[PDB]
Design a binder for this molecule. Sequence first.
Ligand SMILES: [Mg+2]
Ligand SMILES: [Mg+2]
Ligand SMILES: [Mg+2]
Ligand SMILES: [Mg+2]
Ligand SMILES: [Mg+2]
Ligand SMILES: [Mg+2]
Ligand SMILES: [Mg+2]
Ligand SMILES: [Mg+2]
Ligand SMILES: [Mg+2]
Ligand SMILES: [Mg+2]
Ligand SMILES: [Mg+2]
Ligand SMILES: [Mg+2]
Lengths: 327, 52, 41, 137, 95, 95
Amino acid sequence: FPAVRLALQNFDMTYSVQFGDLWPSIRVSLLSEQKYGALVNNFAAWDHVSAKLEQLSAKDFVNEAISHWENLRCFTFDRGDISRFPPARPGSLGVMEYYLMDAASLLPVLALGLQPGDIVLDLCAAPGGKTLALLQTGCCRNLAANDLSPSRIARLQKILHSYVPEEIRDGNQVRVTSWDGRKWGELEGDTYDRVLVDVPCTTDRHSLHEEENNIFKRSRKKERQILPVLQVQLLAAGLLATKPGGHVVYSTCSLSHLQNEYVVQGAIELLANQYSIQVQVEDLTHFRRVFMDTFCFFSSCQVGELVIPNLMANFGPMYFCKMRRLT
Amino acid sequence: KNILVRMVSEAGTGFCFNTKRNRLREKLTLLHYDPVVKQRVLFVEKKKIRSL
Amino acid sequence: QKRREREQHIAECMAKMPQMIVNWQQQQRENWEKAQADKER
Amino acid sequence: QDINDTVRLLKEKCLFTVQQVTKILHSCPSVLREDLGQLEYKFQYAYFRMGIKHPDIVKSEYLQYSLTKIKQRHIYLERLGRYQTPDKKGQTQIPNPLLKDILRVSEAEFLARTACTSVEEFQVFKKLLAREEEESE
Amino acid sequence: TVIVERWWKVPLAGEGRKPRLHRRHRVYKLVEDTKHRPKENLELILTQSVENVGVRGDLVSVKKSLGRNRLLPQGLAVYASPENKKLFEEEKLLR
Amino acid sequence: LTYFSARKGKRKTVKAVIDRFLRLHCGLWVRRKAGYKKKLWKKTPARKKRLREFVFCNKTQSKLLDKMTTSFWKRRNWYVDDPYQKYHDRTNLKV
RNA sequence: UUAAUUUAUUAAUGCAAACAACCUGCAUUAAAAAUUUCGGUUGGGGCGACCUCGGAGCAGAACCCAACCUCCGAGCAGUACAUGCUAAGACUUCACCAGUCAAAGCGAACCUUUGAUCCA
RNA sequence: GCCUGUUUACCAAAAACAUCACCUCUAGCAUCACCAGUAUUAGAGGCACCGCCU
RNA sequence: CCGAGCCUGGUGAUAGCUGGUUGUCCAAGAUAGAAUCUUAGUUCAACUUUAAAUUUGCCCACAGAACCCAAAUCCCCUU
Ligand SMILES: [Mg+2]
Ligand SMILES: [Mg+2]
Ligand SMILES: [Mg+2]
Ligand SMILES: [Mg+2]
Ligand SMILES: [Mg+2]
Ligand SMILES: [Mg+2]
Ligand SMILES: [Mg+2]
Ligand SMILES: [Mg+2]
Ligand SMILES: [Mg+2]
Ligand SMILES: [Mg+2]
Ligand SMILES: [Mg+2]
Ligand SMILES: [Mg+2]
């Protein structure tokens, strides 16, 4: 029994109930190829790369989104189009022109609302992607990124060497640590203004793609079972680290309602009882309407936003919830 | 990933030496010491030896 | 014959060598200057 | 030689009875035009991956349809979860749609009744599957 | 004819001695099958007029099949031996 | 090895030893270092310098090689321009 | 047997050979077979996991060691393209193989994670 | 288990094997089996006499 | 005495397995690392024996051996 088949069995037995008639579409979208967005590097010839992508017929979905939502530029092809993006190559400035990343792993960044001069935390997000997107936002913003895995921290360092110039990377503007997100709540508290908590997840698409280190293999049953506890603890730690009135975004690459809504609800409960701190879930329905053109969203989710994969736009999965710490 | 490539001397000598460069990166031209000529000379990438 | 062919080819390449090195270094420096110009925008 | 090797592929490497071979040839002589290897792949796709048996393969003229169309519809159904390959026991959790409902019908009814999806999604899937096949080969 | 070659070299036997063969010396590789060589032609001297070949006393390169099946068996042609060539040369100079 | 050959009754030489080791007449065996030609691009210059060297064998390694070769390989060879002519003998050795 | 290696032999075809039959050679596909194997650790078995190297526990004070075991990461990446060549003297994972450090000298400039032999 | 039969000579006689009956597959044919036969035939496999309800 | 007859031969098959291995007397003589389709074996090391060459060997009093933050051990003038 391949772990891919085990993951398919679990998804069929759970997400079918969760999604009703949308489950076949989600299933075929997951099993088909993934649509990749191209995020141009703000630290390179951004105008030239954007012109090249527009020649390649991609459009910056981010550009015509902030106008309604109210520097990030990610080019994605139109709905239905399956064209691939040319592989990234080093630019004239000596850095990679663009990053080929899941466009859905950018809505948490755009929903966090990165204001100028705000201190930013990446509690556990260290596969690249969202971290580089946060970096490519402005030249007057300080960010610190942490993750328990030294290999993932090294991957962050490699991508930063590839994209972020030495001048920006070396300074205190970037702070890469490798401590534990759970103990981050004791390492610091009420320090960060904007926090991104991308907990380890079942990463459903990659679980169905790659057999190696598949979370659904029989060996990692204990890890898969303790995942809810780890996710709740990490989200609580992020809510502790964020300042009163600060903003956090909980992110997940899973369709599981257990890992999406129960995690945030349990974190709210635990951090309002064990710590007597009030957190309010902010609405992102405007975000849903703004990005409806580029992504397909599941509406039945009460809290947070779920970008589900569709054949027209194979961009999901991505669940993100915006939470303002009212106390 | 990286590929091992054979930089061949532009000084006319048969001296070649092996370097590593990214596959996506452009073909390499590099100053290197020529033992036969006993002077630093340019070397150009000729062919890809392997993919490491 | 092989030895003298090698010698003359080496001599020709050596005659061209300083100019080639200067041109290559100038190309690298001008690429760097273009990068800084792009940074200026 | 071409006719004989087609018949021998149908009988030996495909285990079709003499009557079944006659029925196939009578129904759709395009099998003879179709090259070997491709024919064997089509038959094994029907047999193993699709779980179909010789009587059904003969009844519904599966060998008449093109391999590209067969894969385009079957893989769509399977990834949608509406079609399941029979287990070692030959059983499925849900009864699979009939070959007439899969291949004989037009794209409209195929996507409306069997797949219950949209034509745009089907076109995107068809292009994706074409890319997948090209990359595999 | 099938022409074969030892895979394993046979050690030299000497002058008057005979080579001693072992099990490995019975392993052969086919270097050529003469039957697959391109066909060559047989040189013949005609004795009687034959359609599309010649008349008499003229050296002709004919397909070996024709030469060995029709011309020679029926006496229409003779081998292009030195003796036959000389005899037909004397015939030509006496005509 | 073969202590008594079936055809001559003689002791045989392990030719794997001859293909790999040089015997200095005094009793020293010289060899190359293993991997001296393998993946040099990923080896440091010091490691490559160590690998490019000709290296002596142990006493027990030398004894094994002596047993595995016959007396022919242990004779005085007066080659014309042998690079090892000076190394064939020991000088100023105390016990 | 969907283990590995074959197809000598038959049976089909194909191409040459002999002028359709028959037969020879060379291929391809099968049938029938033939030959051979069953790594290690964990009461056994299923499902596993691991097998090499490096860092930490794990050894309080030279070394060595708590194997089995716990955690982590590496089959590299970045850099340079003298990050060369040579060479005293040493270390060393308890053998060997292998692996380290290195003065002096020459020459340019002015480094921080593995795999032998054969064979190609 | 249809039956009578058969079997592990020397620890098993049985519900096992066979069996009539039925089904499936293969074969359009001569001078050594099949067979001095020719599709109501021959060979192989399965199943279980039979009879009914679907 | 058939999950594949019997006889002869190859054949003194092979056996890292079991068993055996015959006068007298003296002497030296101990647990030990690595690799291994390897842990019922072997090869190297260590130990062991014999012969030989030479000069130091063992014990050890001080002195000396890390920061992080016990018993002892190593090393060697004397003796
Ligand atoms: Mg002689
Ligand atoms: Mg250790
Ligand atoms: Mg050592
Ligand atoms: Mg009975
Ligand atoms: Mg009875
Ligand atoms: Mg009995
Ligand atoms: Mg009885
Ligand atoms: Mg008997
Ligand atoms: Mg014996
Ligand atoms: Mg005694
Ligand atoms: Mg081995
Ligand atoms: Mg053993």
